[model samples]
Target: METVQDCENKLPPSLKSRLCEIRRYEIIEGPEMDKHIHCVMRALDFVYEDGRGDYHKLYDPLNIIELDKRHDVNLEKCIGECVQVPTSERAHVFYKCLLKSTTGRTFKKVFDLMELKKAGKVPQHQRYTAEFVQIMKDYDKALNC
Candidate 1:
């Protein structure tokens, strides 16, 4: 997924630093995960919502959104459960969820960590971002200054 062609390569170094921080803070617990994502928002937009023409929730490691509303399936819930389960059980739970609830577009040019090949078409603000300091300040306010 770290292929050179992905637009993540073009992201600012601060985003990389935020990735590092997320790694440090990430846990099954909700607060730290929220902190991690807000920290990501502080770094750069981890996602740009255009009605999921590109990135999809299931593919995202940082994703916590609901997948199957009927079954009440969500990645964060799976992770929180898997926190108590073993490795194989973890994989099985995810697979179980996939079979039970995951169905949408059969395919698209999607990669959670990798931007679509449409980089050349995307605007500069949509690509990565230059508002690093302002974003940091916003997150500080969110976290409380």
Candidate 2:
């Protein structure tokens, strides 16, 4: 597994300073492994396959509000361990809860981070762990100030 230091070393010079602090909040104090995976999937708005690298959008056709609503109820069912629904249903629920638990500014930051792909401010090959760390730093700053 890649250590936080290993990930930080690849970040931009300007973003290096807060790496440790942000990693603590973003990786350490956040969710366990499964929830973390779910969070990343939701953040990217896709699911992944072990062999196939490219992400295919899962919630593409739906608007944000529709997605949110589906996520909210699905999460409740997921927590209940509803066997009738597909596992993706449960994962979707996990995504919604994770988002709701986050601060509003944090949510906005995440949305903005996702925009990096379309905005072309950052290259596709750029390390996203750095971006994740920066958003955590933004969340921390909001809490502190």
Per-candidate Cα lDDT values, in order, are: 0.32, 0.40
Per-residue lDDT of 12-127 in model 1, one digit per residue for the tens? 56543454333222223233333333332223332222111112344442232223343233444544444454432343333233333342211111221222222233333332
lDDT by residue for model 2 (14-124), tens: 444555444333433222333343344444554332211121232322224133445334334434542333453444343344354423224434444454443354555
Provide the TM-score for each candidate, comma-separated. Answer: 0.23, 0.26
Q: How many steric overlaps does candidate 1 have?
A: 0
* Model 2 weakest 10-residue run by lDDT: 49-58
Off by over 4 Å in 2: 1-85, 118-145
Note the residue pairs that clash in candidate 2: 75-93
For this target, which candidate reaches the highest lDDT against the unseen true structure? 2
For model 2, state the Cα shift of residue 60 in Å. Answer: 26
- Looking at model 1, report the run of 10 residues with the lowest lDDT sum: 104-113
**Which residue ranges in model 1 land beyond 4 Å of their true spot?**
1-73, 102-145
